[PDB]
């Protein structure tokens with residue numbers, strides 16, 4: 001075993017060496033034929049760039065920023081498959097004046113009516129393109145049933161008789177039972193006007209299906225564009241209709257039918273649920289108007305001021321009407337966003353002591369996805385930010401690669417060093433595009449980072465070259481240089497790539513892509529450095545030999561071997577006691593080094609210095625610990641969208657003027673049997689099999705639990721208001737419900753829904769199959785709150801309230817934010833797992849390149865300590881541990897390992913007798929590269945700080961912390977730690 005270990009250590013070294021020797025020779029080849037390498041590398045890069053032609057973006061927010069658990073998603077599916085939801089467009093008008101003033105009001109009125117005026121031509125409908133693929137045929141049985149149901153629906157509706165006598169109310173079997181079609185046949189749904197949405201799949205291409213009055217019977221997919229242009233539909237055609245009239249929620253409902261008059265003040269009996277008597281249509285003034293100012297007279301309030309008026313337009317959500325709806329919404333959003341009434345408000349007084357203003361915000365279902373498209377493209381701002389960053393790093397590079405002796409200085413390399421990285425980004429991206437990898441919104445930051453990381457290798461190479469001033473034959477110098485820095489530049493990259501790849505495994509596609517693209521970019525960039533940049537180094541080197549400055553060479557063109565460690569050691573020894581030990585004036589890094597040797601190192605060596613260092617880092621870690629205590633997770637999905645987004649702006653306004661009406665949480669109940677049955681025709685709660693298998697809704701106690709639940713949820717502070725029809729029904733006619741007869745229950749509830757005014761309002765929240773309430777629902781408003789954590793807290797509580805365990809009844813609380821927030825729960829662990837894998841993998845790699853084992857252990861300690869610091873301080877800075885932040889933390893390992901490793905490897909390879917000696921040598925030889933690498937990266941990413949997109953700024957903040965601690969520890973703590981307890985001999 002000992003012999004085996006010996007042989008192994010022999011292999012590692014031997015191999016590590018061989019690799020170096022190989023690069024040593026490769027350099028020679030490039031040195032002799034620099035042009036060939038540059039031209040070929042560039043052309044090859046271009047080809048990859050061509051790949052961009054196939055660049056396909058990804059715009060499904062859910063895939064981009066959600067686990068896609070297939071659970072909450074499944075919930076949406078179930079909800080949509082059986083319950084008819086309704087597309088709702090929200091239009092809010094905000095101002096600093098009393099929009100209630102008659103003159104303004106009248107204008108606002110036309111604004112509203114304008115919506116109805118909006119008209120969409122058929123040609124606009126993209127879905128029903130003049131040439132498309134007909135949707136897959138709906139299962140035959142499904143078709144049959146749809147035919148049957150639609151037929152009986154009419155029949156029943158005509159009859160109007162609600163009779164449950166025939167319905168068998170026997171408890172269903174485990175199979176839900178108590179010839180597929182026959183089974184699905186003979187099913188009476190109530191309300192009769194309901195047919196399971198899933199079964200509703202008729203080709204919407206035939207206009208006859210969607211809009212009947214048209215009487216056209218014209219297939220849009222088979223119609224001329226001009227012909228389609230001819231036909232035009234309006235909101236009324238695709239709007240939910242109350243009492244045969246679009247069910248808007250505008251204030252103007254009050255004035256309808258002369259119930260009230262714009263010119264006169266608004267006086268209503270109840271601000272909560274006033275009803276226009278003439279129209280018999282109800283309205284919630286509190287919901288419609290914001291910042292209301294009302295008086296009280298004869299029990300009738302006198303609304304006399306409001307600086308916000310919101311109108312909700314309800315549009316059908318049926319599959320058939322889906323394509324058409326989207327079209328109208330698009331027209332609507334444009335219309336509202338550009339509508340302006342500044343003229344009327346010009347002289348009207350303000351309450352904000354600011355210029356009279358009026359703004360029309362609008363939010364439709366298509367809004368979110370549309371905004372995703374906007375975030376998909378590369379904002380000009382981002383572009384600009386990149387440019388600034390590139391300039392910064394360009395300046396920094398040059399400012400460090402230029403000197404008094406121009407021919408000695410190597411500006412060319414620096415310049416191309418930057419490009420090298422960029423070209424890498426393009427080439428890599430193109431390669432991935434070729435592979436089909438879709439781009440993501442977070443990819444905007446990829447260029448920024450890639451460039452920064454790449455330029456770092458440039459510094460390293462140059463450092464080796466410069467420190468090899470002794471060498472006379474340039475070819476040899478370049479060769480030796482590359483040989484010296486080969487392992488370093490290779491490992492550094494390898495580590496980075498590895499980390500990103502490991503991260504790519506993330507479920508969230510955004511992270512996956514961002515990482516994948518970055519990793520590929522880094523890879524190709526490295527290749528470019530070994531080719532392009534190296535070739536440029538060769539050219540400049542050759543010029544230096546001739547002492548020909550770049551410009552000089554241009555006009556003109558138009559017309560031994562010693563370990564650097566050995567040398568540096570000898571230098572110090574010699575110092576302790578010539579040309580070899582005197583860097584030529586203008587060596588690329590001559591100054592900085594001198595500064596480090598004559599100032600920084602002395603300080604570090606100083607006991608007082610050390611004292612300071614240790615204490616400083618001490619407190620740093622301490623602060624980090626407290627930071628961890630203040631750890632908060634989660635970020636609102638909307639944050640993704642730029643703040644400027646009208647969506648974001650809309651939400652803000654709503655919150656400001658309508659705080660109570662925040663999240664419209666919706667709770668649903670879905671009999672497992674019913675769901676399963678119909679789900680079948682179209683070939684967590686599931687925890688317990690009998691969770692919702694069979695519920696006797698006639699059980700008075702159960703009924704009582706229901707009303708109690710309503711009361712409980714109402715009590716909850718976060719809940720602002722609830723609308724549970726069942727409660728209304730139970731309270732309305734509990735006496736009749738006293739007798740617990742299943743059939744009786746069905747009939748009573750059915751009639752209640754059919755007749756009672758309130759009941760009619762809740763007609764679409766209850767569905768009965770064969771006399772049994774297979775599914776139902778109720779909704780409640782949850783006050784708006786920013787913290788994702790507290791939000792989830794509230795929702796989770798709601799779930800508890802909605803779980804009649806005694807009667808085996810568990811209802812599902814649903815909200816859009818649910819899926820996104822759901823991810824927050826597991827973010828804490830997944831990160832640990834990923835980080836762990838990364839750390840390990842990276843450590844293993846370093847171990848194979850770090851000579852001493854003890855040095856490896858030192859590195860690990862440093863890495864972990866940094867990570868604690870970067871995490872602790874992110875929490876301390878308030879950076880929530882969101883997806884964006886976490887990935888950066890996990891990825892941080894790569895950056896940190898690089899800087900730490902360089903110093904460590906040097907200290908080990910030092911020939912210094914005393915530990916301190918080694919430290920000084922290591923620092924004098926690698927401190928420059930380390931500093932340059934980190935700083936360069938930060939400079940490029942600095943501009944991201946001014947990015948509108950929230951996720952971007954988080955990226956900047958987190959990475960800035962990473963880089964900071966990395967460089968800090970690598971340049972300060974690590975040195976002193978090694979100087980005190982470092983591997984010796």
Ligand SMILES: CC(C)CCC[C@@H](C)[C@H]1CC[C@H]2[C@@H]3CC=C4C[C@@H](O)CC[C@]4(C)[C@H]3CC[C@]12C
Pocket residue numbers: 273722723758761762779
């Ligand atoms: C005795 C009665 C008249 C008092 C007032 C009852 C009101 C507050 C009840 C009865 C009908 C209920 C409405 C029924 C339908 C809907 C549409 C749904 O998408 C949101 C909730 C909402 C808007 C309900 C809100 C609360 C509601 C308006």
Ligand SMILES: *[C@@H]1O[C@H](CO)[C@@H](O)[C@H](O)[C@H]1NC(C)=O
Pocket residue numbers: 161162163164165166
């Ligand atoms: C329901 O139908 C059955 C069978 O036709 C009949 O006997 C009973 O009287 C009906 N009850 C009603 C009309 O509610």
Ligand SMILES: *[C@@H]1O[C@H](CO)[C@@H](O)[C@H](O)[C@H]1NC(C)=O
Pocket residue numbers: 141179180181680681683
């Ligand atoms: C019923 O369920 C599905 C859909 O028709 C099918 O796979 C199965 O064979 C059917 N069986 C019968 C009895 O029709």
